[PDB]
Amino acid sequence: KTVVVTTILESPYVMMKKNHEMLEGNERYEGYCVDLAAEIAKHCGFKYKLTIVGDGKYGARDADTKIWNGMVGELVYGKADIAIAPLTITLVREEVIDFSKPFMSLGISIMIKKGTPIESAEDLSKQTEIAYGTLDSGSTKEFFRRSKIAVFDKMWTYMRSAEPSVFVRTTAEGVARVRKSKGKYAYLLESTMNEYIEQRKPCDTMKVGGNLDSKGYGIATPKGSSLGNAVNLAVLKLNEQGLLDKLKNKWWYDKGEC
Amino acid sequence: KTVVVTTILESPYVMMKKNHEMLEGNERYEGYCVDLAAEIAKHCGFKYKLTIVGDGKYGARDADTKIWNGMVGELVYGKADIAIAPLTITLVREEVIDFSKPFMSLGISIMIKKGTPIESAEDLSKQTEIAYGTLDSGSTKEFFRRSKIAVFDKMWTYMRSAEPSVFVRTTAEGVARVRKSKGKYAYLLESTMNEYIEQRKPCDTMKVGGNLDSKGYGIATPKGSSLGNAVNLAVLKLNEQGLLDKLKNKWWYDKGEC
Numbered sequence: 001k002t003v004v005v006t007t008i009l010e011s012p013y014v015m016m017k018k019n020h021e022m023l024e025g026n027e028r029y030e031g032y033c034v035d036l037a038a039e040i041a042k043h044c045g046f047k048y049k050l051t052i053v054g055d056g057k058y059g060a061r062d063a064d065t066k067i068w069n070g071m072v073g074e075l076v077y078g079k080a081d082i083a084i085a086p087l088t089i090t091l092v093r094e095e096v097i098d099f100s101k102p103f104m105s106l107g108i109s110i111m112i113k114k115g116t117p118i119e120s121a122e123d124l125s126k127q128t129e130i131a132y133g134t135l136d137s138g139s140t141k142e143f144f145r146r147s148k149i150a151v152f153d154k155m156w157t158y159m160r161s162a163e164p165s166v167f168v169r170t171t172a173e174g175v176a177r178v179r180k181s182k183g184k185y186a187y188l189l190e191s192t193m194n195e196y197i198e199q200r201k202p203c204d205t206m207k208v209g210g211n212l213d214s215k216g217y218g219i220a221t222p223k224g225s226s227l228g229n230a231v232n233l234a235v236l237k238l239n240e241q242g243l244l245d246k247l248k249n250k251w252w253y254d255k256g257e258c
Numbered sequence: 259k260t261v262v263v264t265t266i267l268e269s270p271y272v273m274m275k276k277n278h279e280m281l282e283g284n285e286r287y288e289g290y291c292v293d294l295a296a297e298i299a300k301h302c303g304f305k306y307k308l309t310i311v312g313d314g315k316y317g318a319r320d321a322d323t324k325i326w327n328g329m330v331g332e333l334v335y336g337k338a339d340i341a342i343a344p345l346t347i348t349l350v351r352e353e354v355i356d357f358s359k360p361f362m363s364l365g366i367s368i369m370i371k372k373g374t375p376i377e378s379a380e381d382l383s384k385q386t387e388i389a390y391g392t393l394d395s396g397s398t399k400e401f402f403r404r405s406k407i408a409v410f411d412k413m414w415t416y417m418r419s420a421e422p423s424v425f426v427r428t429t430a431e432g433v434a435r436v437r438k439s440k441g442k443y444a445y446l447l448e449s450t451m452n453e454y455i456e457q458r459k460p461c462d463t464m465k466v467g468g469n470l471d472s473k474g475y476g477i478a479t480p481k482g483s484s485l486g487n488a489v490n491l492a493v494l495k496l497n498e499q500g501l502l503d504k505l506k507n508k509w510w511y512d513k514g515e516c
């Protein structure tokens with residue numbers, strides 16, 4: 001049986017190639033997770049089909065219906081066999097799906113236009129002249145919603161009732177908002193993404209301060225999957241071979257344009 | 259039944275309290291892992307007994323005899339029920355015991371005596387006046403032994419044949435060797451340990467260069483253990499609640515001497 005891989009279009013993890021119109025199947029995509037999927041498939045010895053998650057979300061549970069959406073949902077409901085993407089390993093998700101050991105370590109970070117008078121999370125929480133927000137349906141937003149840390153909770157009370165919404169639907173929208181806000185909007189996002197964008201022209205953003213937390217991205221499989229065990233060992237093997245470090249260089253700095 | 263916890267005497271993870279002779283049981287020890295053990299036990303709801311691994315090793319399989327030593331061996335042979343220590347998550351170990359998601363992220367790093375003209379692994383590899391080695395019997399030594407990367411293999415070729423041995427029995431031994439080397443010996447060890455020592459008197463060592471790799475420490479249990487699932491969720495919950503960050507600040511910087 002061909003393994004159905006659910007993923008998400010998020011640069012530089014998964015992106016359509018420039019000449020995709022003349023390509024088919026998995027050949028239409030390129031990126032860190034596309035190379036990773038190939039590596040895993042080869043090691044676990046299976047054929048696969050990359051599919052972009054329907055609703056374009058990572059995964060959250062509807063408070064009222066208790067229904068899971070995003071990639072997590074595709075696994076939970078059996079629409080996908082494995083998820084290979086920048087999916088954060090979290091307690092609530094671990095309760096419903098399986099995660100391999102992390103293939104990438106990261107943390108929440110701050111993205112500023114450039115020249116913006118902000119160097120830390122505290123700086124943001126001290127003023128209101130500069131707005132800030134996060135992605136939606138993600139682990140970053142939830143981080144602030146649940147944080148008991150004085151500063152982070154103070155940052156959440158603002159973001160929650162912020163008018164208009166400081167939250168964005170996709171990373172691209174957040175980065176776009178930062179760039180066109182004359183430095184009046186700071187974006188909170190996962191460090192790996194921050195670092196990638198900082199190397200992308202117009203080269204007008206920069207990551208500031210240390211990460212607010214420490215987390216990891218993991219490959220996910222549904223509970224009781226015959227793939228989980230093998231995939232977990234594959235990730236460890238790949239990290240130990242240095243392949244994972246090889247891949248980040250390739251997609252983050254070898255292609256940097258700043 | 260009371261859970262038997264195996265751990266190792268490695269500062270600041272586990273250390274005998276100054277007046278341990280006056281105390282009994284678990285109260286005899288203090289440290290990052292002692293604090294972590296208490297929390298994991300509370301959240302998982304079990305009583306435990308801390309025990310220092312008999313042979314003072316982390317865990318390796320002897321080729322030929324096929325016997326596992328160290329903390330890994332105690333889990334494999336059923337002498338301990340869980341290992342709470344700076345035990346590196348590795349593929350070979352993952353094949354015989356279970357690991358929770360990492361509670362700490364780190365990488366191999368370089369420790370020099372302040373003033374040593376070394377800034378990278380490449381630097382070490384391209385010279386010979388300054389000797390260098392690693393802890394013996396651990397994941398750091400194995401990283402070099404198994405590495406297929408040019409720089410690191412070149413480093414391993416030197417270390418494995420150096421005489422007298424550049425390997426050390428304990429971290430304290432490696433650090434003391436660096437301190438009395440007059441800059442003629444550099445020590446390769448895990449980043450978190452390097453960072454800790456850099457904050458201890460006489461304040462004569464320093465971490466240089468970026469980490470050579472990326473990995474993490476995890477709580478280990480025997481395969482098929484009844485505690486596995488709960489311990490894993492506890493680690494994720496404790497990280498998400500910020501405890502892990504609080505603990506590292508407590509044992510690394512709050513008590514810094516430099």
Ligand SMILES: [Zn+2]
Pocket residue numbers: 039243
């Ligand atoms: Zn490979």
Ligand SMILES: [Zn+2]
Pocket residue numbers: 062063064065
């Ligand atoms: Zn709803």
Ligand SMILES: [Zn+2]
Pocket residue numbers: 297300301
């Ligand atoms: Zn607690």
